[PDB]
Amino acid sequence: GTHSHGLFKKLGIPGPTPLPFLGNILSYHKGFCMFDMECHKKYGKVWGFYDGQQPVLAITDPDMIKTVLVKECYSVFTNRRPFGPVGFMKSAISIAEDEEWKRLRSLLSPTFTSGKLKEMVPIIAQYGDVLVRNLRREAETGKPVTLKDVFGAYSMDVITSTSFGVNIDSLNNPQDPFVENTKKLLRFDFLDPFFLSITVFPFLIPILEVLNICVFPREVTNFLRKSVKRMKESRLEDTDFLQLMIDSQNSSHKALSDLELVAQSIIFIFAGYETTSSVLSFIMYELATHPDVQQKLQEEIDAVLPNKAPPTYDTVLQMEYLDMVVNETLRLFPIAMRLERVCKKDVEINGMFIPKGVVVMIPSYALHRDPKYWTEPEKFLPERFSKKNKDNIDPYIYTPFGSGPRNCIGMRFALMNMKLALIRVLQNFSFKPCKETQIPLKLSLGGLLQPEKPVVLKVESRD
Amino acid sequence: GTHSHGLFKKLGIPGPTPLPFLGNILSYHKGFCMFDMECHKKYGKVWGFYDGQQPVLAITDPDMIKTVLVKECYSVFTNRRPFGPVGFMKSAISIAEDEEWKRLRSLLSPTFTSGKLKEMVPIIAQYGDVLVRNLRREAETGKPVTLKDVFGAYSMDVITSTSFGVNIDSLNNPQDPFVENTKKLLRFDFLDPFFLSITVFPFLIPILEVLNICVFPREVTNFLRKSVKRMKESRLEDTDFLQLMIDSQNSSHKALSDLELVAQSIIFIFAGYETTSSVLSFIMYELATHPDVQQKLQEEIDAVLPNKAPPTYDTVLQMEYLDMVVNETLRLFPIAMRLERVCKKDVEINGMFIPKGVVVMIPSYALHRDPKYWTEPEKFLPERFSKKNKDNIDPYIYTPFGSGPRNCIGMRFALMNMKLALIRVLQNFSFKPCKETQIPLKLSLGGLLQPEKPVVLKVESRD
Numbered sequence: 001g002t003h004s005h006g007l008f009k010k011l012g013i014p015g016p017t018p019l020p021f022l023g024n025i026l027s028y029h030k031g032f033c034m035f036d037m038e039c040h041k042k043y044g045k046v047w048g049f050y051d052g053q054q055p056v057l058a059i060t061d062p063d064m065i066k067t068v069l070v071k072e073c074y075s076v077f078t079n080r081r082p083f084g085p086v087g088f089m090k091s092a093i094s095i096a097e098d099e100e101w102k103r104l105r106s107l108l109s110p111t112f113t114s115g116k117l118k119e120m121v122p123i124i125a126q127y128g129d130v131l132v133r134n135l136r137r138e139a140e141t142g143k144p145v146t147l148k149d150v151f152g153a154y155s156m157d158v159i160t161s162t163s164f165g166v167n168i169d170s171l172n173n174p175q176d177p178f179v180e181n182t183k184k185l186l187r188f189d190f191l192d193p194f195f196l197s198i199t200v201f202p203f204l205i206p207i208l209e210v211l212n213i214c215v216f217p218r219e220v221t222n223f224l225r226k227s228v229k230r231m232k233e234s235r236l237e238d239t240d241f242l243q244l245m246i247d248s249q250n251s252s253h254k255a256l257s258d259l260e261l262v263a264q265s266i267i268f269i270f271a272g273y274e275t276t277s278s279v280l281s282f283i284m285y286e287l288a289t290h291p292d293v294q295q296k297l298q299e300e301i302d303a304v305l306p307n308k309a310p311p312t313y314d315t316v317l318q319m320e321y322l323d324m325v326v327n328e329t330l331r332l333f334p335i336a337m338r339l340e341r342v343c344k345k346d347v348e349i350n351g352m353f354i355p356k357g358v359v360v361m362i363p364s365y366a367l368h369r370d371p372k373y374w375t376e377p378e379k380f381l382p383e384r385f386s387k388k389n390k391d392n393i394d395p396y397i398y399t400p401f402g403s404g405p406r407n408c409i410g411m412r413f414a415l416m417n418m419k420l421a422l423i424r425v426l427q428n429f430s431f432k433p434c435k436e437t438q439i440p441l442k443l444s445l446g447g448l449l450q451p452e453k454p455v456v457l458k459v460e461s462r463d
Numbered sequence: 464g465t466h467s468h469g470l471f472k473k474l475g476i477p478g479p480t481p482l483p484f485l486g487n488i489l490s491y492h493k494g495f496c497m498f499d500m501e502c503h504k505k506y507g508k509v510w511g512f513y514d515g516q517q518p519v520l521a522i523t524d525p526d527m528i529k530t531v532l533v534k535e536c537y538s539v540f541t542n543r544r545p546f547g548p549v550g551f552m553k554s555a556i557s558i559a560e561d562e563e564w565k566r567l568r569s570l571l572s573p574t575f576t577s578g579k580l581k582e583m584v585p586i587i588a589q590y591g592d593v594l595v596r597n598l599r600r601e602a603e604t605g606k607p608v609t610l611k612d613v614f615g616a617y618s619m620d621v622i623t624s625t626s627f628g629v630n631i632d633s634l635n636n637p638q639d640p641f642v643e644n645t646k647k648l649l650r651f652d653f654l655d656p657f658f659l660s661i662t663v664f665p666f667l668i669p670i671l672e673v674l675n676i677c678v679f680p681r682e683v684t685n686f687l688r689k690s691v692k693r694m695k696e697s698r699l700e701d702t703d704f705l706q707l708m709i710d711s712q713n714s715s716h717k718a719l720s721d722l723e724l725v726a727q728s729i730i731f732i733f734a735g736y737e738t739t740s741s742v743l744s745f746i747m748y749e750l751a752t753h754p755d756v757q758q759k760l761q762e763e764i765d766a767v768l769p770n771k772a773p774p775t776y777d778t779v780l781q782m783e784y785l786d787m788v789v790n791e792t793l794r795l796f797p798i799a800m801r802l803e804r805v806c807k808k809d810v811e812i813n814g815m816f817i818p819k820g821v822v823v824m825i826p827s828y829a830l831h832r833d834p835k836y837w838t839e840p841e842k843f844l845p846e847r848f849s850k851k852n853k854d855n856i857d858p859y860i861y862t863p864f865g866s867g868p869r870n871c872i873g874m875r876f877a878l879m880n881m882k883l884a885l886i887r888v889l890q891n892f893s894f895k896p897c898k899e900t901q902i903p904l905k906l907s908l909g910g911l912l913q914p915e916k917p918v919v920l921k922v923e924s925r926d
């Protein structure tokens with residue numbers, strides 16, 4: 001069961017000794033982030049471990065990281081680890097490979113430009129207002145407030161409107177079908193029984209595909225596929241992502257088909273829905289446990305936007321401390337945790353040989369808390385991202401959205417989305433720890449970056 | 464079960480309608496060659512069928528064939544269909560892929576040059592003499608002679624000597640270990656229960672690999688691996704392929720390792736052993752059923768080599784009619800039957816779109832018997848390959864060894880090998896049909912190009 005478990009001993013590369021068949025997976029008992037920090041401390045700048053029989057080489061040298069994510073991206077490090085069983089969701093850009101990915105990224109890039117994002121800001125702003133009305137009703141009843149729920153509704157509202165023109169107050173229609181289905185598109189727990197097993201028996205992935213078993217719930221995807229097929233034909237008569245993609249089908253590429261279009265629509269929901277609500281919850285925890293930060297930010301918002309003035313695209317990008325608070329929260333909680341690329345050819349990068357087929361992994365969470373780059377890394381200190389101090393911040397250490405050609409395509413949208421929500425809420429409310437607030441917050445031990453206990457806070461109206 | 468069975472209907476490409484899950488495999492009941500001839504006649508110049516869910520596109524236009532095998536070989540059509548479970552035999556050049564194959568073909572090409580072949584001719588000639596002595600003893604007892612056995616011993620003798628310096632009279636030591644093991648390296652029956660099942664459930668191949676199940680008998684390969692490891696270290700103190708490969712390990716490539724070297728040694732045995740004896744048996748059938756051909760050839764040998772003179776490299780290549788007889792036999796019996804390349808990128812070749820992942824198949828057997836290139840294709844007529852008529856012979860229709868960069872690397876060796884045997888035997892014997900000779904010879908219905916009944920003939924001494 002150790003066909004390939006001698007690879008890192010041969011390369012003279014250090015690392016935790018793997019068990020037969022399991023490789024190192026038993027060390028995931030404390031989750032991805034703990035394993036990566038320990039390996040970093042124990043073994044230093046480079047190490048290896050085995051996901052079953054798959055060798056994973058962790059790298060932490062920023063130059064080596066830039067080779068992987070930027071320099072040799074197209075040549076050597078184009079793809080991520082095979083992810084399935086996926087079915088027709090194989091055509092989603094985040095899952096595609098090589099030339100198919102290159103085409104899809106090209107066909108989809110114009111959809112995410114700052115110009116398009118600016119055009120979508122009025123829609124996103126509408127649902128900040130929906131958020132405040134629903135936040136107030138819970139602020140008007142002295143009842144603690146679980147963040148993930150209120151931001152969940154908000155993220156849902158943004159998604160349905162910006163991707164399909166569906167305009168729903170999802171917290172108050174939690175049971176409309178379109179909410180009912182998209183609500184199921186959550187982050188995957190890559191350490192749950194299923195996804196672990198796929199690591200111990202990946203030779204079982206093609207078997208699942210042949211049985212039409214898919215990691216994306218088949219009902220939800222079918223619901224959306226016909227819904228998209230319905231909208232596409234209704235709009236044909238008489239801003240949203242769907243319309244942008246429909247427009248792109250009217251031109252040097254082949255063009256995206258109808259099924260390629262549905263796969264993007266689904267993957268954007270999946271990428272944005274629970275991620276956005278998770279970060280917003282982490283941000284609010286940091287504000288409630290750091291009231292001066294919350295006060296200073298509330299004063300900054302009030303300066304750019306007096307009389308609780310509605311935020312716009314340009315005023316959002318005017319707010320520095322807002323940017324610093326968002327970025328410092330993404331440093332402590334980089335919710336993807338790791339970046340990965342498959343090494344597709346025998347190569348050598350900055351004087352290290354990398355055998356074809358190794359997964360090169362960048363442990364983002366662990367680097368965000370490295371003392372060798374971040375003083376007092378455990379503390380929420382937004383000053384690190386001040387305009388004076390950002391020059392010493394290495395874009396290859398801080399990678400909440402990845403880097404290079406395969407970085408998060410939704411990065412700009414997601415930052416603007418979250419900033420719009422924080423502005424509107426903070427113009428209206430302050431956020432206070434309850435007795436039931438977990439302090440300090442503790443991270444879950446599974447394959448998701450989330451708190452052990454849900455974040456619950458007091459929400460008082462600024463009247 | 465028809466995820467991909469609509470591909471050829473979408474491309475407007477004709478072909479036999481596939482069953483769910485099986486694709487078209489049930490049409491292999493009469494073997495590869497019959498299926499290909501029928502499809503050719505029925506559907507014309509291009510058609511499709513499904514090996515389970517794998518789409519296979521047959522092409523017959525010589526220009527399109529040259530694009531596949533020569534023009535876009537490195538760019539698009541580099542690999543054959545995945546073949547496994549193979550274990551460490553994955554490093555054999557005939558199984559390797561992409562850059563690994565390119566390297567191995569480069570590292571091995573100098574081993575097959577005309578210069579090396581000429582140096583090996585004296586060894587091969589020695590076993591022609593062993594052949595004649597063993598043929599005579601069966602010619603001296605008026606007993607019919609099964610060809611595959613006598614040529615089998617000969618092909619075995621050539622292999623052990625040219626690849627390892629092992630010099631054995633294998634017909635008379637049929638039970639020495641080195642014969643015992645290599646005797647098991649026969650052609651695969653790609654239509655037998657196992658290899659069919661791998662076509663209906665190829666998702667089961669990775670499963671077999673994880674269980675260390677291999678299509679090459681594990682005992683034989685282990686026997687040879689240590690035998691090679693033993694010889695490598697004995698020769699180190701105090702012509703063969705092994706020595707040529709050992710020498711290559713002493714130099715712009717990485718160099719072939721010890722295990723890469725063993726994999727070549729094994730694959731060359733496997734490629735040469737039963738193929739050479741099969742063709743030699745087909746040739747002798749054609750001579751016995753065409754005595755004038757046999758007479759004319761025997762007179763040609765006697766002219767170049769008077770007094771039963773031993774053949775040499777240069778006199779072999781002097782014999783035209785010998786060449787014509789060998790080539791006409793390889794036209795009627797091209798024992799690989801088909802050539803294949805995986806289309807690795809969405810491409811278009813001579814105005815036909817080919818989707819990535821399709822297997823492009825060239826049906827060699829069917830083209831060797833096409834009336835649109837070969838008059839009276841069923842008859843053994845060596846005149847087609849006369850120096851006058853060879854100018855109308857299209858190197859992309861006649862492909863007994865394939866074409867392009869991925870053609871049979873052993874072609875020159877195998878022709879010389881067989882020619883040396885035919886010369887020595889025909890200098891000494893004539894070959895006559897017995898009552899028990901199957902006439903006309905009928906091909907087996909399995910996944911091997913072989914006669915239904917074994918070829919048995921009378922062998923009289925020319926004294």
Ligand code: HEM
Pocket residue numbers: 069093094095105267268271272275276279335336339340399400401402403404405406407408409410411413414415
């Ligand atoms: C705060 C929310 C989000 C975070 C932290 C985040 C983070 C990331 C990260 C770390 C990656 C991997 C980057 C790499 O491999 O270098 C990624 C990829 C990606 N993200 Fe996000 N993301 C977020 C929201 C979104 C949104 C709203 C979208 C909407 C379209 C989106 C679409 C994608 C896609 C399509 C990819 C794959 C890109 C490719 O393979 O070419 N993400 N994201």
Ligand code: HEM
Pocket residue numbers: 532556557558568730731734735738739742798799802803862863864865866867868869870871872873874876877878
């Ligand atoms: C009469 C005997 C033989 C015949 C008819 C034959 C025929 C063929 C054919 C049709 C192919 C496929 C070519 C293509 O895909 O274009 C091939 C490949 C090959 N043959 Fe043979 N062959 C014979 C004997 C040998 C021998 C004696 C060797 C000894 C080394 C050998 C080694 C190979 C190898 C290594 C390949 C794969 C080449 C590559 O993938 O680069 N064969 N042969």
Ligand SMILES: OC(Cn1cncn1)(Cn1cncn1)c1ccc(F)cc1F
Pocket residue numbers: 080094095187270271272275335336337408449
């Ligand atoms: O898995 C992703 C990151 N990723 C994208 N391709 C490969 N990995 C999906 N995703 C992309 N944008 C948003 N989500 C992820 C999973 C969990 C998470 F918290 C963030 C995160 F990026």
Ligand SMILES: OC(Cn1cncn1)(Cn1cncn1)c1ccc(F)cc1F
Pocket residue numbers: 543557558650733734735738798799800871912
């Ligand atoms: O399968 C082969 C041809 N081939 C090589 N790579 C892929 N296919 C093996 N082989 C190569 N030289 C000799 N044998 C074959 C099988 C049967 C046969 F009769 C000929 C034949 F070439």
